[PDB]
């Protein structure tokens, strides 16, 4: 296997309570792994609850962990960090979080859409936190200039975290042309980069017309015009072109390159989607690693048997150069679940999926040596990093 899946899945809490849906359904994690604890924890994750049929619960939420497995809500935090929208006309989606070393703060992004045709379109929005508990607009951010001034005291390391206290990073008049924003600070060029998938005003059925665009920003707040990436995905094992759906990017210092796990597909839409790996020296020009999928749906009846969904990763360096560990928090869905018994996070059959649970949404984990993973992807039993 390119990655070894851990049995069961990880317990993320979801705030919603809805009789027609099983509890604690979640998707689209984004994990930050730090060298030293930030507000008590080395691992921080943003994620969204989600269920079939209604998207109103799909609101950025935060947890933290000492091990990347057992997640908790930090004391004093109340999820979600961005409120439930006032009606089903709107929904949130696609959270991604970065640690800003210069400000010692986390920056959590997400996508907000007006789903109504001929509506106002969508935005990528942003909440920042100093303390891990309060997520919003820094008190030293000036909304008139869009400058985040560095705090000069501990008392200036605060935010406003009310319902309206977010920054609009990007706006578009189309609904679905900035899906799954993923952000990295490029410490060579000294610029923030955001990649997103442009599905126009169409979305899930746009299919092979989809393409990834990148944008640049000096601060992570105000962004330039998009340009298309090149070579993002290649051919699968049948020689069929893959299209992007959702993605996560990291710069990996040990490999001297950007690395992306892409949730992608070869047919008309992301049903049955898989993960593929793709790399780049510059963030612009990519090359898929091999033809084989990094991760695929499990066997019929497993919690990940319909599709692999957006996934987040950390390359954990080893004691020698080029010999790290790929740690992957993957979301996925199980098909055909209405009224069916499904697994709990320990892999035991204790959860009754409900009437309107057409599918079940969960977050799990997979891992491998980077070298072993590359050997599988490349069909090269002797691959080692250069
Ligand atoms: Ca990320
Ligand atoms: Ca630098
Ligand atoms: Mn999404």
319 token code pair: 């004691």
Looking at the CA of 191, which ligand is closest? 2
Residues lying with their CB under 5 A of ligand 3, a single-atom ion:
93-94
Cα(153) to ligand 3 centroid in Å equals 38
Q: Which residues of 351-379 are buried (b: 16+ CB within 10 A; e: fewer)?
A: bebbebbbbbbbbbbbbbebbbbbbbbee
Q: Report how far residue 286's alpha carbon sits from residue 189's, in angstroms, rounded to the nearest whole number.
A: 18
254 token code pair: 């040990």
- For residue 189, count other CB atoms closer than 10 A to its CB: 10
Q: Report how far residue 218's alpha carbon sits from residue 191's, in angstroms, rounded to the nearest whole number.
A: 5
Instruction: Find all residues with CB under 8 Å of 116, minimum gap 6, and list them.
Output: 89
Cα(111) to ligand 3 centroid in Å equals 8
Cα(300) to ligand 2 centroid in Å equals 48
Mapping DSSP onto H, E and C, the string for 6-40 reads CCCCCCCCCCCCCCCCCCCCEEEEEEEEEEEEECC
Q: Report how far residue 189's alpha carbon sits from residue 194's, in angstroms, rounded to the nearest whole number.
A: 14
53 token code pair: 């049929």
Cα(179) to ligand 3 centroid in Å equals 6
Which residues share a beta bridge with 91?
Answer: 113
Q: Report how far residue 321's alpha carbon sits from residue 111's, in angstroms, rounded to the nearest whole number.
A: 36
Q: Which residues of 282-297 are buried (b: 16+ CB within 10 A; e: fewer)?
A: ebeebebbbbbbbbbb
Residues lying with their CB under 5 A of ligand 2, a single-atom ion:
187, 190
254: phi then psi, degrees, rounded to nearest 5: -65, -30
DSSP 161-189: -STT--EEEEEESSSSSSEEEEEEEETTT
Q: Which residues of 15-35 are buried (b: 16+ CB within 10 A; e: fewer)?
A: ebebeebbebbbbbbbbbbee
Distance of CA 268 to the CA centre of its chain: 22
Using the structure block, give the residue that is written with the tokens 């899906």: 179
Cα(340) to ligand 1 centroid in Å equals 33
Looking at the CA of 273, which ligand is closest? 3
Q: Report how far residue 34's alpha carbon sits from residue 99's, in angstroms, rounded to the nearest whole number.
A: 8
Cα(182) to ligand 1 centroid in Å equals 5
Q: List Cα–Cα distances, 16 to 13, 59, 91, 113, 239, in angstroms.
A: 9, 10, 14, 20, 43
Looking at the CA of 185, which ligand is closest? 2
């Amino acid at each position: 296997s390119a990655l070894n899946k851990a049995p069961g899945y990880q317990d993320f809490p979801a705030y919603y309570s809805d009789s027609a849906h099983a509890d604690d359904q979640v998707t689209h994690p984004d994990v930050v792994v730090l060298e030293e604890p930030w507000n008590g924890y080395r691992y921080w994750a943003v994620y969204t609850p989600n269920v079939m049929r209604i998207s109103i619960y799909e609101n950025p939420s935060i947890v933290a962990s000492s091990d990347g497995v057992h997640w908790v809500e930090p004391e004093g935090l109340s999820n979600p960090i961005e409120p439930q929208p006032p009606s089903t006309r709107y929904h949130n989606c696609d959270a991604d979080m970065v640690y800003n070393a210069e400000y010692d703060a986390m920056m959590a992004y997400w996508n907000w859409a007006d789903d109504q045709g001929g509506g106002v379109g969508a935005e990528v929005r942003l909440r920042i936190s100093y303390d891990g508990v309060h997520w919003g607009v820094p008190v030293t951010y000036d909304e008139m200039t869009r400058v985040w001034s560095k705090p000069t005291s501990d008392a200036e390391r605060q935010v406003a975290d009310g319902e309206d206290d977010f920054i609009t990073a990007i706006a578009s008049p189309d609904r679905y042309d900035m899906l799954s924003p993923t952000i990295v600070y490029d410490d060579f060029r000294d610029v923030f980069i955001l990649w997103a998938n442009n599905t126009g005003d169409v979305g899930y059925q746009n299919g092979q017309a989809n393409f990834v665009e990148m944008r640049y920003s000096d601060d992570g707040i105000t962004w330039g015009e998009p340009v298309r990436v090149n070579g993002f995905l290649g051919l699968d094992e049948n020689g069929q072109q893959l299209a992007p759906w959702h993605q996560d990017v990291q710069y990996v210092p040990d490999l001297k390159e950007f690395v992306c796990i892409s949730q992608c597909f070869a047919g008309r839409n992301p049903d049955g989607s898989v993960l593929h790996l793709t790399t780049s020296k510059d963030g612009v020009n990519w090359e898929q690693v091999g033809t084989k999928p990094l991760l695929s749906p499990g066997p019929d009846g497993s919690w990940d048997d319909f599709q692999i969904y957006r996934s987040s990763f950390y390359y954990e360096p080893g004691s020698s150069a080029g010999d790290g560990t790929m740690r992957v928090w993957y979301s996925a869905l199980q098909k055909d679940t209405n009224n069916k018994m499904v697994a709990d996070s320990s892999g035991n059959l204790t959860i009754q999926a409900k009437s309107e649970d057409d599918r079940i949404w969960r977050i799990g984990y997979a891992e491998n040596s980077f070298v072993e993973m590359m050997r599988v992807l490349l069909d090269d039993p002797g691959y080692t990093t250069p």
